[PDB]
């Protein structure tokens, strides 16, 4: 039932992709994101699509940094992630994409970005940034990498 | 201690200040001795740490979470968008609003403390023991929350 979380992610992502609402969600796997989690605002909150949409409503106190998911919970919102210095990044991509890449360099975390500019959905994992994702594409990557 | 109870109050105050100034409607019910589980089961489970920032994000108008009541239970936002009973008091006009009737409603049926910000005015009210304290100062609502939550 790690699927319930994936369908909650799916609700949130569909809503924000269509409306070009920027979103940054890192999911902890084996590498502890402890030192990054303690830079954010504590939520320790149950995962629902509704909560994820509300966090990322633009011009709100929680929309800016990273949501970090750990166990079954939203641990924090507005967490600071390491920003990638990689010169291999296509530059059309913003701070959310540099956060996504930068946390993938130091961990095995899986990060979802919704572009604030285009509503383009991205997953980052193992330095690989996978932009331009459709619904069935992001749902399969997430299911594959989280069961 | 009171150190964490003072932190809860500081979270409410930040939320109240932000929404009052923007005329953002808000309803926050704080469980004390009366169980509110029958009302909590009607909402969307958050089970979240209390922060001013989360409370602001919850109540942004026309958002999934902004409607109904946040219920706080044992230092946790248990739910958003929860049902509370509407007061049917002979003392209350039709021209009172939904959140104000809910606030009066829950204070008739529980020792809960309810904060409401008027979406029409930004006026801050607290209901407690069948009593509605209307158009509160920051200093007033701080003093009421300090005396009842601590």
Author numbering:
A (entry chain AAA): 145 to 291
B (entry chain BBB): 142 to 291
From the paper:
The enzyme CdaA, which synthesizes an essential second messenger cyclic di-AMP (c-di-AMP) in many pathogenic bacteria, has emerged as a promising candidate for the development of novel antibiotics. Additionally, c-di-AMP regulates the bacterial stringent response, further underscoring its significance. The synthesis of c-di-AMP is mediated by enzymes possessing a diadenylate-cyclase (DAC) domain.
However, suitable crystallization conditions for unliganded LmCdaA could not be identified. Therefore, structurally related CdaA enzymes from S. pneumoniae, B. subtilis and E. faecium were cloned, overexpressed in E. coli, purified, crystallized and evaluated for diffraction quality. Additionally, we report the first crystal structures of apo CdaA from E. faecium (EfCdaA) and S. pneumoniae (SpCdaA), as well as atomic resolution structures of BsCdaA.
